[PDB]
Amino acid sequence: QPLSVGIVGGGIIGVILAAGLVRRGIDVKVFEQARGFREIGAGMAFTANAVRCMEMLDPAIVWALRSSGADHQAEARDYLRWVDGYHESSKRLYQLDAGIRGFEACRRDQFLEALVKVLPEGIVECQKRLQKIHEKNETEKVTLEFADGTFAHVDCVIGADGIRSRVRQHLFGEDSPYSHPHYSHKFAFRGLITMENAISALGEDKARTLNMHVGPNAHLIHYPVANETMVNIAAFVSDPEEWPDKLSLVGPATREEAMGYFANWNPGLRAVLGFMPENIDRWAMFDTYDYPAPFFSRGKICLVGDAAHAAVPHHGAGACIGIEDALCATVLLAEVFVSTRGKSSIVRNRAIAAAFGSFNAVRRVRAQWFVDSSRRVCDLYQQPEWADPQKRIKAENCFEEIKDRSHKIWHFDYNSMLQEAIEKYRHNMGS
Amino acid sequence: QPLSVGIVGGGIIGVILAAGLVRRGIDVKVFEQARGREIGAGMAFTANAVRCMEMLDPAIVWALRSSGAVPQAEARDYLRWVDGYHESSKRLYQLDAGIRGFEACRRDQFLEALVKVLPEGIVECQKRLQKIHEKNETEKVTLEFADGTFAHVDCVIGADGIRSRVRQHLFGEDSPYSHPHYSHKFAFRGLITMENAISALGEDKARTLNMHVGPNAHLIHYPVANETMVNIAAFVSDPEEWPDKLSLVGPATREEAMGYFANWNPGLRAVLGFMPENIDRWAMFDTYDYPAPFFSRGKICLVGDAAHAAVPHHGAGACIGIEDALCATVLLAEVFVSTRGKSSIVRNRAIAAAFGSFNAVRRVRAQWFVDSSRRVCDLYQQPEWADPQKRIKAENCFEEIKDRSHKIWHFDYNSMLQEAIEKYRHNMGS
Ligand SMILES: Cc1cc2nc3c(=O)[nH]c(=O)nc-3n(C[C@H](O)[C@H](O)[C@H](O)COP(=O)(O)OP(=O)(O)OC[C@H]3O[C@@H](n4cnc5c(N)ncnc54)[C@H](O)[C@@H]3O)c2cc1C
Ligand SMILES: Cc1cc2nc3c(=O)[nH]c(=O)nc-3n(C[C@H](O)[C@H](O)[C@H](O)COP(=O)(O)OP(=O)(O)OC[C@H]3O[C@@H](n4cnc5c(N)ncnc54)[C@H](O)[C@@H]3O)c2cc1C
Ligand SMILES: [Cl-]
Ligand SMILES: [Cl-]
Secondary structure, X not given: OOOEEEEEOXXXXXXXXXXXXXXOOOEEEEEOOOOOOOXXXXXXXXXXXXXHHHHHHOHHHHHHHHOOOOOXXXXXXXXXXXXXXXXXXXXXXXXXXXXXXXXEEEEHHHHHHHHHHHOOOXXXXXXXXXXXXXXXXXXOOEEEEEOOOOEEEEOEEEEOOOOOOHHHHHHHOOOXXXXXXXXXXXXXXXEEEXXXXXXXXXXXXXXXXXXXEEOOOEEEEEEEEOOOOEEEEEEEEEOOOOOOOOOOOEEEEEHHHHHHHOOXXXXXXXXXXXXXXXXXXXXXXXXXXXXXXXXXXXXXXXXOOHHHHOOOOOOOOHHHHHHHHHHHHHHHHHHHHHHOOOOOHHHHHHHHHHHHHXXXXXXXXXXXXXXXXXXXXXXXXXXXXXXXXXXXXXXHOHHHHHHHHHHHHHOOOHHHHHHHHHHHHHHHOOO | OOOEXXXXXXXXXXXXXXXXXXXXXXXXXXXXXXXXXXXXXXXXXXXXXHHHHHHHOHHHHHHHHHOOOOOOOOOEEEEEEEEOOOOOOOEEEEEEEEEOOEEEEEHHHHHHHHHHHOOOOOEEOOOOEEEEEOOOOOOOEEEEEOOOOEEXXXXXXXXXXXXXXXXXXXXXXXXXXXXXXXXXXXXXXXXXXHHHHHHHHOHHHHOOXXXXXXXXXXXXXXXXXXXXXXXEEEEEEOOOOOOOOOOOEEEEEHHHHHHHOOOOOHHHHHHHHOOOOEXXXXXXXXXXXXXXXXXXXXXXXXXXXXXXXXXXXXXXXXXXXXXXXXXXXXXXXXHHHHOOOXXXXXXXXXXXXXXXXXXXXXXXXXXXXXXXXXXXXXXHOOHHHHOHHHHHHHHOOHHHHHHHHHHHHOOOHHHHHHHHHHHHHHHOOO
């Protein structure tokens, strides 16, 4: 008596969830609206904790990760570094050791392609944009209606459909503000410079490592790419205005626009912006902070990843939080699968809803904390006090909070989460 | 290039190990002497070993659960002990292992399902290892088979069971350390119908797992085949040596078994009377008298029964082997990622450093377990079970059985892996 899951969204979280479920004998379909891959060329990095979670989902996921990234001596340790970007002192302010392979980086689209190759053929169906969800009785299948006029029927539905999730809209009502992300009043300029130019502006040490330059109402992060031949720039600035509804969240911008937000900053940082191409990109940062989900699941429908808890990217770990979701959901549905073998339709479908209730109970606090924490650390990166020389010691005390919040992300006890999830599932079943 | 592993032996541990390694991108060959296999018996895994299997590859647990029968609230797994020697048949002790504290399967169906999980081209049958040729750490290890063929691999794992040839290579064919030895106990095995089991024992015992204790022997039974049959294993003491090259399995009669239990209570004597006229006798050998001085040397490592074969009185010997497989897999995956773009000298040094960490972190628990398996049997078979005036002493054994059982079932495999990785890095000069 086999259990079928309809995953809406074939991004990194939906495909990782599919891989975990299928390796456990669960019948999975992934419905993706797009015709192929997106985010061509972008990099991302995963904490060691998230990588262990990937291994538990399916060790082949980690093989795919390590196939999708990058001499003797010793093993390198991964550091985060903060630098004063406003004053000419330009002095190193803080650093955090994450350890050997404390982060593992890849090219996003290459990783996603390698993951699709891990799945059995046919799991992912493209050009399948969810339009409407039709729920009947718990003992009946959930029907998914796509924009192309087709339908699919599954025992349960997972929304892995990202920041503008259609599954979320179904749950809360397409007119509810809770169904939609909102603007964080910050946007980012993104572009590259050559490593040669990066060294001119910053020196070899900074040019070849990851650094965040803090200051008043803005901040800049850079790190090397393409085999240390270029350096990727992200400059985040404050925007007092609204982002107009239906104005695209990505648009073209000029080097000189970015330069103007950093005119009072120190020269090395200004030089970095000066070395970017004339034409760069502007990215609005939206999230689920203002109207956080009242629940991640209801009935036989569950949200995971950015659909549940899209965050602004100031911890660099939003996907890591989604991989935790995918592990939790996978372990739960496999327990539904084994524990209801031989039982009636009524019992199996009650078990699905019981497991999804446990998922919500176990994940929602950490996930929504993380969304709050991503805004908070950005505020600390951007303190107005960084410019006020009468307040550079209160400003510099933020770093103990940054450490504690980072460690809370990086040192997650996922085995306790899974234990708590199984016990809450069993409790919800009257045991 | 990738890292290649030659696994000698395609039993449950060798195939589970292969599954873990290949899912991490390591190049594996499994060399099995037999033509192609296992026996129809059932076996059970602790919840802890099942979690270890999942970490190797979740499909291993899928194979397990699809290779075992289908069971309103969820049953907890209990171990139960009964007095076999007095018509009292009193219930002496019980341990609660929780929901799916054990998961059972048929060995032959599990192994076949596992081979289907592996990619094609991994398992090579009729490959009986005859000799290992080691050279410099930086050269491949050469395996020579009885059919005159050869294989060349970066490192060798002996998963070749209780009469391991890899073990004989390490210690020498004339060393007692190269061979298992007799525990001076053997088992009668057979089946009866559940109807007959109910008649002899009552329905509650007939339908549950029970161990009947008594002087110098003991008997375990449990239901099989979806509660239509009951499997019987009756262990007795043998003061004689087992002739060296006499086979360890052989034919026997129900009357022979009945004689060993003639003084035992009637229900249990009836169980034996209900067996078929012809049954099997299994000699119990292990590595207790001459345990391995090391599980690994250079680029050769032992796992499973090749490292630490035990007599079966904890019902968890393969569980210990699965821990081995997990440890070796995690170590070799760390060799693979940490030496990715380094020289052959470094990669081969790392293999040896990994196998050295394996030995350092696994040998104590595994050799403790072989001794424990004999010890609990001594407790099940105390002479004092015969004497009603010594009952307090005899029943006092169950706290030690509980301690030993929990040490097996509650193993901290995550700390073991952290320790293995730390010892590997230390061995590499960091
Ligand atoms: C600049 C930036 C940098 C980041 N860097 C990191 C990092 O280094 N490490 C990290 O952990 N996280 C990082 N994150 C966060 C991370 O990218 C996200 O958390 C992650 O992409 C969420 O994955 P997802 O599958 O939930 O959603 P998505 O990646 O948004 O995928 C959703 C999928 O659903 C499809 N879809 C949408 N609607 C429908 C529909 N109606 N029907 C069918 N399909 C639909 C979409 O086409 C898409 O493919 C970063 C985020 C940003 C913005
Ligand atoms: C009656 C009994 C009941 C048991 N019940 C349980 C239980 O319930 N739960 C549990 O965890 N454990 C149980 N065990 C222990 C368990 O059976 C063993 O630990 C397990 O089989 C060990 O597996 P292995 O792969 O190391 O060795 P084996 O199963 O012995 O496999 C070794 C393989 O290596 C091959 N081989 C041998 N020599 C060579 C050679 N020169 N070249 C190539 N191939 C070779 C062999 O043909 C064989 O296929 C029980 C044991 C017994 C005797
Ligand atoms: Cl992020
Ligand atoms: Cl055993």
